[PDB]
Amino acid sequence: MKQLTILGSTGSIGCSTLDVVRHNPEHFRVVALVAGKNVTRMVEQCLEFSPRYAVMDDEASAKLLKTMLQQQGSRTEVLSGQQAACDMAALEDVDQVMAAIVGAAGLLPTLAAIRAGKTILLANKESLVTCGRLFMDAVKQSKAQLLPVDSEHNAIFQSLPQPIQHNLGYADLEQNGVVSILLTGSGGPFRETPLRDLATMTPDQACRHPNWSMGRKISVDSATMMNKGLEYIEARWLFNASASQMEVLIHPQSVIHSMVRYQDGSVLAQLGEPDMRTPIAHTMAWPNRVNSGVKPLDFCKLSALTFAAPDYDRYPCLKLAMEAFEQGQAATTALNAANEITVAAFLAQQIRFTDIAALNLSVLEKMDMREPQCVDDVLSVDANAREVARKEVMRLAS
Amino acid sequence: MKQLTILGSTGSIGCSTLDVVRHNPEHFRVVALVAGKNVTRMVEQCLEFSPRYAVMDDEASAKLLKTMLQQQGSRTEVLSGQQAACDMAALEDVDQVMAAIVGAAGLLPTLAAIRAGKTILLANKESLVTCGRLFMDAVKQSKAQLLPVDSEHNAIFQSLPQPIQHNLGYADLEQNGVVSILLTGSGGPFRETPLRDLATMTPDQACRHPNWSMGRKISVDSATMMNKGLEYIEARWLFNASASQMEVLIHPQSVIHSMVRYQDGSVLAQLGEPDMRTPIAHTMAWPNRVNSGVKPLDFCKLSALTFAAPDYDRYPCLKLAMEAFEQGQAATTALNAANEITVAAFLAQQIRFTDIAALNLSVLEKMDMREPQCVDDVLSVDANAREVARKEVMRLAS
Numbered sequence A, B: 001m002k003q004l005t006i007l008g009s010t011g012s013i014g015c016s017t018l019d020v021v022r023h024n025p026e027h028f029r030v031v032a033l034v035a036g037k038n039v040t041r042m043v044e045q046c047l048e049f050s051p052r053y054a055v056m057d058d059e060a061s062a063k064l065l066k067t068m069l070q071q072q073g074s075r076t077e078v079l080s081g082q083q084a085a086c087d088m089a090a091l092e093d094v095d096q097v098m099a100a101i102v103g104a105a106g107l108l109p110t111l112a113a114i115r116a117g118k119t120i121l122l123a124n125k126e127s128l129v130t131c132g133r134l135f136m137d138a139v140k141q142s143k144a145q146l147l148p149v150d151s152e153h154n155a156i157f158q159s160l161p162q163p164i165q166h167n168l169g170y171a172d173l174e175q176n177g178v179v180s181i182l183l184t185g186s187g188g189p190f191r192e193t194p195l196r197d198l199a200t201m202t203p204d205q206a207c208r209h210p211n212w213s214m215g216r217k218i219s220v221d222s223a224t225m226m227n228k229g230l231e232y233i234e235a236r237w238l239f240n241a242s243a244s245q246m247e248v249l250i251h252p253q254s255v256i257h258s259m260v261r262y263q264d265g266s267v268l269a270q271l272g273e274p275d276m277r278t279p280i281a282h283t284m285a286w287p288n289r290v291n292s293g294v295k296p297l298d299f300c301k302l303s304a305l306t307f308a309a310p311d312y313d314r315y316p317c318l319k320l321a322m323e324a325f326e327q328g329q330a331a332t333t334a335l336n337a338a339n340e341i342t343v344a345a346f347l348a349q350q351i352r353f354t355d356i357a358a359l360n361l362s363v364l365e366k367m368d369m370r371e372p373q374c375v376d377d378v379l380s381v382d383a384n385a386r387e388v389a390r391k392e393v394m395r396l397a398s
């Protein structure tokens, strides 16, 4: 029996995680739930799973949650704020922490779980992207184990040998017969959209992913392929891969979730339904398996599986992420921050869909900070880039 | 340094095996080569790899080989016959034996390697099919290591967890999170051929496999899908799988080589170029990897990947194989024997392509013999089936 804290319980990943728990009450128990502002969902989750604690980051949301749960006779203690989220991630009683807060806001609570030596079920890719080597070193220095939840990285993990799996981030790919890591793939909802129509796409259009039901931020990132850029960076840290050991491949059906090339010509892959309960359950049970609620993939009802080279002209954000990573951590931290601001602006109908990539570039051109030496420096670059991004958004205020 | 005996060196698998040796001369050396009657090829292989011994089954071929080797200055010594092949498989200095003789003729030399405790690179599926549990038990009692070379079984092996890999044939699939084994798939050269045009198909037409360049016997088996039937039986022994843990899937492109379903919905697969050097190299180097000479799979050049359920009515041999396995080992041994006789008669233009399945069923219906309790019994059932099959072929003589 393993006890769990879920960071970001009310969102897409959080709810999928709770469904895996629902299917396996003998194996998993929720001790703490952490979220932002969705009180309605958090009340529902607390009444079902009777967590010891529930945390809302937003102070006013926490007040409402405390009152509502008290009237319902809940035993759950309600806390509030960022520090309480960190406290939950570090509960001495907890074995696993689902890191599923969106954006760099998840970094401090995720780092707290790492310092406490927990098993980190890493969905929140922005935390690793923005923190980089400092993140990976903290996992090694403490007793922590990273298990990749993100679909592609989970697929790659499943398709790697045990010496790599058991020394994630530091083992040598070539010594284990790996030639490269093949990161797929979808292209998003606008893959075939005429280029001239991109400027007038709405938030609802951008968030209708053809294959995955996800949160709004990552759905927009999938439409620009900034998501694939962030995942490229994530893969390089997780699997200790160089630029020459990474391939990006478009696969519009999202059945093959990613692959690994070996020296003898073999390519190992993970396939399945586009359902995050599968990778979540992989990480929660590893090295064993559990029922996730996902049924067997029916190969007789599939679309034909196709592949293609990335259309870099169409998706400037992909190349931007790759070049930021080349430049260094300051540029990468700045780019992630800029993208959080521009995506949020687009969702709030302040800028156009095509302004995301342009404003992201504009922020990078205006920033030239030194490489972070500690987590405080990562946060300074992040904060600075957010401010630059807010000013660029306001310049396009209609 | 690993020293090899290759059973069936001059054939399709044998030549691919020697190309892996050619690419890795610091890792592999050939001690003995065993073949049938292809003297010309054996001469070339002896001159290049300088084996201590060469064995031809054909006594006239051994005579010719000796003369040619002595004329051309080779120090390779020549023997002949089945017993000599068994002796080559059990040499002290031999580490690995490539079992790549076609048909049940490979059984005794393969069993000799097993009893000597060698690493068995098993390509010769008919030996396991015809001997079944007695084969798997011999491996267990002698502490030989079985590594599947057959493309599909190698792909499944690569897609299974370590506890199954390290206890092949005796570990529990369910305890290791496996739901089923997915066996693909091609359908053969007559997949789209109208049923009424099969009667006039020539040996060359049946042997023209759309995806794999192989020996003539297995190529005809792929045309009737008897090969997939034999592979179904092979898979159930190797991976300790029940009928409900097996799935057969048509996959015309032969890019996905086979797959494994897990409890959480995950499907693991191996893909690659349709080139046997890949799986051969995988077994030769295991648990490490080597360059096999096979180029990396170009996903952008691939045809769309498709899947379909088997058409058992078009392919009565596939159904007959699955039925014979449920009936027991006597029926399975008899069917394999019958099919060796009918395929050979078809290749020699004694019977029609459509006579293969018809005569195979006829032989099984006339066969009533006891379950083999030992290898001698397997040989008696096999010999009896061949008699019945030969009689049936002779009745169709023009």
Ligand SMILES: NC(=O)C1=CN([C@@H]2O[C@H](COP(=O)(O)OP(=O)(O)OC[C@H]3O[C@@H](n4cnc5c(N)ncnc54)[C@H](OP(=O)(O)O)[C@@H]3O)[C@@H](O)[C@H]2O)C=CC1
Pocket (backbone or CB within 6 Å): A007, A008, A009, A010, A011, A012, A013, A014, A034, A035, A036, A037, A038, A039, A057, A085, A099, A100, A101, A102, A103, A105, A106, A123, A124, A125, A126, A149, A150, A151, A212, A213, A214, A215, A216, A217, A218, A276
């Ligand atoms: N959804 C998916 O299929 C995949 C998601 N991911 C990653 O997982 C992470 C979560 O994404 P997703 O679930 O889609 O996003 P959602 O918007 O659906 O959920 C985000 C969660 O984070 C919470 N949250 C936001 N800010 C804070 C804060 N500062 N403190 C505590 N909690 C906070 C939200 O609370 P609330 O809603 O109550 O305000 C919500 O529970 C992202 O990093 C994403 O990249 C990766 C692969 C796939």
Ligand SMILES: NC(=O)C1=CN([C@@H]2O[C@H](COP(=O)(O)OP(=O)(O)OC[C@H]3O[C@@H](n4cnc5c(N)ncnc54)[C@H](OP(=O)(O)O)[C@@H]3O)[C@@H](O)[C@H]2O)C=CC1
Pocket (backbone or CB within 6 Å): B007, B008, B009, B010, B011, B012, B013, B014, B034, B035, B036, B037, B038, B039, B056, B057, B085, B099, B100, B101, B102, B103, B105, B106, B123, B124, B125, B126, B149, B150, B151, B212, B213, B214, B215, B216, B217, B218, B276
């Ligand atoms: N080719 C492929 O892609 C695959 C093959 N296999 C299996 O591997 C085995 C070999 O197949 P393949 O290479 O295609 O067949 P081939 O016809 O190309 O080769 C058969 C080999 O066996 C030799 N041989 C035949 N009879 C005897 C005998 N009685 N004693 C010693 N050697 C003998 C042949 O000698 P010679 O030619 O000199 O007469 C030849 O070297 C088969 O069991 C097949 O099912 C499995 C998966 C794939």
Ligand SMILES: CC(=O)[C@@H](O)[C@H](O)COP(=O)(O)O
Pocket (backbone or CB within 6 Å): A150, A151, A152, A184, A185, A186, A187, A188, A212, A218, A221, A222, A227, A228, A276
């Ligand atoms: C489900 C998941 O892990 C997403 O990160 C996925 O990458 C989205 O699809 P795209 O490939 O279109 O970004």
Ligand SMILES: CC(=O)[C@@H](O)[C@H](O)COP(=O)(O)O
Pocket (backbone or CB within 6 Å): B150, B151, B152, B184, B185, B186, B187, B188, B212, B218, B221, B222, B223, B227, B228, B276
């Ligand atoms: C390469 C190999 O292992 C063959 O056995 C393969 O199975 C032949 O193709 P079919 O799938 O058409 O039988």
